[PDB]
Design an enzyme around this catalytic site. Structure first.
Site, PDB file in Angstrom:
ATOM      1  N   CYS A   1       0.354 -42.792  48.480  1.00  0.00           N
ATOM      2  CA  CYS A   1       0.184 -43.351  49.815  1.00  0.00           C
ATOM      3  C   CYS A   1       1.028 -44.611  49.967  1.00  0.00           C
ATOM      4  O   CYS A   1       1.347 -45.291  48.992  1.00  0.00           O
ATOM      5  CB  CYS A   1      -1.283 -43.696  50.098  1.00  0.00           C
ATOM      6  SG  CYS A   1      -2.407 -42.297  50.055  1.00  0.00           S
TER       7      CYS A   1
ATOM      8  N   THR B   1     -10.066 -43.415  42.646  1.00  0.00           N
ATOM      9  CA  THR B   1     -10.630 -42.102  42.349  1.00  0.00           C
ATOM     10  C   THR B   1      -9.587 -41.264  41.639  1.00  0.00           C
ATOM     11  O   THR B   1      -8.396 -41.524  41.766  1.00  0.00           O
ATOM     12  CB  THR B   1     -10.992 -41.341  43.618  1.00  0.00           C
ATOM     13  OG1 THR B   1      -9.804 -41.146  44.394  1.00  0.00           O
ATOM     14  CG2 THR B   1     -12.025 -42.106  44.429  1.00  0.00           C
ATOM     15  N   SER B   2     -10.032 -40.254  40.901  1.00  0.00           N
ATOM     16  CA  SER B   2      -9.096 -39.379  40.214  1.00  0.00           C
ATOM     17  C   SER B   2      -8.288 -38.610  41.248  1.00  0.00           C
ATOM     18  O   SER B   2      -8.806 -38.227  42.296  1.00  0.00           O
ATOM     19  CB  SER B   2      -9.837 -38.411  39.298  1.00  0.00           C
ATOM     20  OG  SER B   2     -10.156 -39.054  38.080  1.00  0.00           O
TER      21      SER B   2
ATOM     22  N   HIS C   1      -1.609 -43.168  43.048  1.00  0.00           N
ATOM     23  CA  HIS C   1      -2.131 -43.848  44.226  1.00  0.00           C
ATOM     24  C   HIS C   1      -1.091 -44.912  44.519  1.00  0.00           C
ATOM     25  O   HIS C   1      -0.209 -45.166  43.707  1.00  0.00           O
ATOM     26  CB  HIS C   1      -3.455 -44.560  43.923  1.00  0.00           C
ATOM     27  CG  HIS C   1      -4.649 -43.661  43.879  1.00  0.00           C
ATOM     28  ND1 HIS C   1      -5.244 -43.157  45.016  1.00  0.00           N
ATOM     29  CD2 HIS C   1      -5.383 -43.203  42.836  1.00  0.00           C
ATOM     30  CE1 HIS C   1      -6.296 -42.432  44.676  1.00  0.00           C
ATOM     31  NE2 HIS C   1      -6.402 -42.443  43.359  1.00  0.00           N
ATOM     32  N   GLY C   2      -1.197 -45.549  45.673  1.00  0.00           N
ATOM     33  CA  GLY C   2      -0.246 -46.591  45.992  1.00  0.00           C
ATOM     34  C   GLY C   2      -0.368 -47.130  47.396  1.00  0.00           C
ATOM     35  O   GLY C   2      -1.228 -46.726  48.178  1.00  0.00           O
TER      36      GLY C   2
HETATM   37  C1  LIG Z   1      -3.141 -42.502  48.459  1.00  0.00           C
HETATM   38  O1  LIG Z   1      -2.432 -43.436  47.642  1.00  0.00           O
HETATM   39  C2  LIG Z   1      -3.185 -41.105  47.774  1.00  0.00           C
HETATM   40  C3  LIG Z   1      -1.812 -40.583  47.299  1.00  0.00           C
HETATM   41  C4  LIG Z   1      -1.954 -39.433  46.329  1.00  0.00           C
HETATM   42  O2  LIG Z   1      -3.057 -39.257  45.774  1.00  0.00           O
HETATM   43  O3  LIG Z   1      -0.980 -38.692  46.062  1.00  0.00           O
HETATM   44  N1  LIG Z   1      -3.944 -40.062  48.491  1.00  0.00           N
HETATM   45  C5  LIG Z   1      -5.260 -39.899  48.362  1.00  0.00           C
HETATM   46  O4  LIG Z   1      -5.962 -40.680  47.721  1.00  0.00           O
HETATM   47  C6  LIG Z   1      -5.797 -38.694  49.129  1.00  0.00           C
HETATM   48  C7  LIG Z   1      -4.936 -37.675  49.561  1.00  0.00           C
HETATM   49  N2  LIG Z   1      -5.338 -36.520  50.148  1.00  0.00           N
HETATM   50  C8  LIG Z   1      -6.633 -36.354  50.321  1.00  0.00           C
HETATM   51  C9  LIG Z   1      -7.557 -37.311  49.931  1.00  0.00           C
HETATM   52 BR1  LIG Z   1      -9.399 -37.071  50.211  1.00  0.00          BR
HETATM   53  C10 LIG Z   1      -7.151 -38.485  49.329  1.00  0.00           C
END
Ligand SMILES: *C(=O)[C@H](CC(=O)O)NC(=O)c1cncc(Br)c1
Ligand SMILES: *C(=O)[C@H](CC(=O)O)NC(=O)c1cncc(Br)c1
Lengths: 140, 91, 91, 140
Positions: free
Chosen positions: D130, D29-30, D88-89
């Protein structure tokens, strides 16, 4: 306030698990010299005023049993908790004398919700153990 | 309310995925360096800065020696993993 | 001669294996806290101590909210991974 | 001397890789709001006197290509290197717009033996991503 309150009645516990001799079936060589580290650590943390408890050659079971029991104690009057693990290991793992114990498992005993007497207090883990087999050839 | 993973400090004798040296008579590079830095700086420095001293020491003053080319002349950098919420002083 | 892995500092927005929160309009808890602490302490503190400030802030002032029970009321602790050999000052 | 020499001609580079939009096939997702972090980081490191370069939505390829190229530059007159990854990660991984890039791979470009112009200088990596899916329910 930006520094941990270290003025509690006692500095805390300092558990030093020194594994030198492993079960033949593990294929782990003895960790010669680790006794020196154990004595040193003991002397040093003794002078830092921590209650030091040395445990030698504990099995994986005993290690968990130990951490469980230590986490169930009352640390209300203590400032911090220090746990030193001296043994063989790999990333996220340290070896009991008869097999491996993942770090996460013995660390969860002390997290916020599990050990309420240490909540908000510094939980220090010093680990002398390999985290794999890669070697650093240095530079310059 | 705070994180359950908070107020933790993992002081690794070596970097992730790496080997960790131990001398049969002097002890492990990391431990003997750690103890040494605690003795001189426990009453003068914040813990993070002491470990940083430990890092520089282990990184600087130690180098493996072996008849086995593969393990000869190797270095080691400790790894500080802090999830601490405050500065830690032993005084 | 020094380790090739030396002089590295990894400042993770969250603890190992954990999720990392981001606000659609305020940014990520970690980043907005990081930037904030740099602004007030870049000229007054050593980097490790600044990140520690970042940790306490993210740990203290943030808590997820969601209609999804599973993600509701969650916390987050950043993770400082230092293989630095000296104290770092931005001045 | 126990502090890094930060008096070189320039503070150094500050590479900010801000990935907000991913390829549909990744299923990512964005990352809304990341633009705020990018601007903020840019402003902050600008005031810290770092040369800031913002790169947005780079593919895994471009990320490596970028780190390779940055590591091959001459950092003789620079004090430090800062690299910010927003994406993401998972543990040891960050996502390019079209797939993952393990951290180790883009970090090796800067290690002692590879990037000699940065040897002995602070190499900072700030990662907003993440490291898995576990959630912290807090306590107290
Ligand atoms: C997981 O890799 C990511 C890291 C980021 O986007 O910096 N986090 C999310 O996808 C996420 C973070 N906070 C709220 C939501 Br809903 C999703
Ligand atoms: C790998 O887990 C261990 C860690 C330790 O014993 O503290 N290291 C060795 O087995 C080792 C270290 N130094 C020299 C030799 Br030979 C072996």
């Amino acid at each position: 306030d930006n520094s941990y309150k270290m003025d509690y009645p006692e500095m805390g516990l300092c558990i030093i698990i020194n594994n030198k001799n492993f079960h033949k079936s593990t294929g782990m060589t003895s960790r010669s010299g680790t006794d020196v580290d154990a004595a040193n650590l003991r002397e040093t943390f003794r002078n830092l005023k921590y209650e030091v408890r040395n445990k030698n050659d504990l099995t994986r079971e005993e290690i968990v049993e130990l951490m469980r029991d230590v986490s169930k104690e009352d640390h209300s009057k203590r400032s911090s908790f220090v746990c030193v693990l001296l043994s063989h290991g790999e990333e996220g793992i340290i070896f009991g004398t008869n097999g491996p114990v993942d770090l996460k498992k013995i660390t969860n005993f002390f997290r916020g919700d599990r050990c309420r007497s240490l909540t908000g207090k510094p939980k220090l883990f010093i680990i002398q153990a390999c985290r794999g087999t890669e070697l650093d050839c240095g530079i310059e | 309310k705070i994180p359950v993973e908070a107020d933790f400090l993992y002081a690794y004798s070596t970097a992730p995925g790496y080997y960790s040296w131990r001398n049969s008579k002097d002890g492990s590079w990391f431990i003997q360096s750690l103890c040494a830095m605690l003795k001189q700086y426990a009453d003068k420095l914040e813990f993070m800065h002491i470990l940083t001293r430990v890092n520089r020491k282990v990184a600087t003053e130690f180098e493996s020696f072996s008849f086995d080319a593969t393990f000869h002349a190797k270095k080691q950098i400790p790894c500080i993993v802090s999830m601490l919420t405050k500065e830690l002083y032993f005084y």
